[PDB]
Design a protein around this ligand. Structure first.
Ligand SMILES: OC[C@H]1O[C@H](OC[C@H]2CNC[C@@H](O)[C@@H]2O)[C@@H](O)[C@@H](O)[C@@H]1O
Length: 333
């Protein structure tokens, strides 16, 4: 019931049924940024999968379609005019998931066409021995926030199509990213910049997409090293991207990072599910489950009277949909 209450409250506060988009904040003066809207789309899908209330489930299923329609009305169906390859890939990944839920052809086309544009034209072997460029305008940096989401999108497309092309892509992208965008012990680097090298700044959302791609690769390949990869990145997050009480950091003031716990929590749930299913890493699993539950309880203890939780989970006017999404995500694992 907590997940249902949280999602209903989030919609009541932030969903605009007229534009079929989320508001960026509770002043209701501007709709959410394009890339973040794909992440709120996935939140709707996660609540759809989590709920056991058939009436709410049907409403959320409809909302999956309405989110796409509202975005396409403002931004079009062809996102390849957007210079941000990551923006495109977040929508390609969301579209693959929407296809799995709904069966509507438009979503498979959207996923496959946009994945192909990025992977087939924005992969480069010369700089840094591999990796996808951040932008399709200028080619100066290759980033975790495009590469790991691309591996995830490829894994969804493999699951849908069974075409080994997509598994091969996920494997190649992840191998490059593990080698060039991590320290080999679970710390995920932000990016590798031409003429400079690695920028080893770690953030919640890049830990998340690394973990999710690793768990997906473990499941698709049967290679246990990928599960180990995921566990090491989860451990790094729990020990090194938290405050002194173990509560996940607040990553403001940057607007893109403020809500990153949303993406982290989505992917930590994948890891929790796989550990529960396989019985692997039982010691870590117990520690991890306790730490997750603690974070969730602390976050929700700061909910306001409308059942909205700001993204500064360690503490207590205007609430923002991206920063507030993480607490909702956490109850819809
Ligand atoms: O420092 C945060 C963030 O900044 C830049 O990306 C911003 C967004 C652009 N497109 C949508 C999201 O994927 C990004 O967060 C990049 O420098 C990025 O690597 C970095 O984490």
């Amino acid at each position: 019931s907590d997940g249902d209450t949280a999602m209903k409250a989030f919609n009541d506060t932030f969903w605009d049924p007229n534009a079929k988009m989320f508001w960026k904040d509770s002043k209701r003066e501007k709709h959410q940024d394009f890339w973040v809207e794909a992440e709120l789309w996935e939140l709707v899908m996660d609540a759809y999968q989590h709920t056991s209330d058939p009436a709410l489930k049907a409403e959320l299923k409809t909302q999956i379609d309405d989110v796409y329609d509202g975005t396409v009305a403002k931004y079009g169906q062809d996102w390849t005019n957007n210079p941000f390859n990551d923006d495109i890939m977040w929508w390609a990944m969301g579209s693959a998931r929407a296809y799995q839920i709904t069966g509507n052809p438009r979503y498979l086309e959207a996923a496959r066409d946009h994945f192909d544009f990025v992977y087939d034209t924005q992969w480069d072997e010369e700089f840094a021995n591999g990796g996808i460029w951040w932008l399709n305008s200028d080619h100066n940096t290759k980033n975790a926030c495009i590469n790991f989401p691309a591996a995830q999108a490829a894994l969804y497309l493999y699951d849908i199509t069974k075409d080994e092309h997509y598994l091969n892509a996920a494997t190649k992208i992840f191998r490059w990213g593990k080698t060039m965008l991590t320290d080999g012990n679970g710390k995920v680097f932000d990016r590798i910049e031409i003429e400079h090298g690695a920028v080893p700044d770690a953030t919640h959302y890049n830990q998340g997409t690394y973990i999710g791609s690793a768990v997906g690769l473990y499941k698709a390949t049967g290679n246990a090293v990928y599960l180990d990869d995921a566990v090491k990145a989860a451990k790094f997050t729990k020990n090194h991207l938290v405050d002194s009480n173990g509560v996940l950091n607040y990553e403001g003031p940057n607007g893109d990072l403020k809500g990153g716990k949303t993406i982290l929590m989505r992917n930590l749930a994948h890891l929790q599910k796989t550990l529960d299913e396989t019985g692997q890493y039982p010691e870590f699993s117990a520690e991890f489950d306790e730490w997750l539950a603690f974070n969730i309880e602390m976050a929700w203890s700061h909910q306001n009277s409308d059942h909205i939780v700001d993204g500064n989970w360690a503490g207590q006017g205007t609430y923002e949909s991206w920063s507030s999404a993480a607490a909702v995500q956490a109850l819809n694992g």
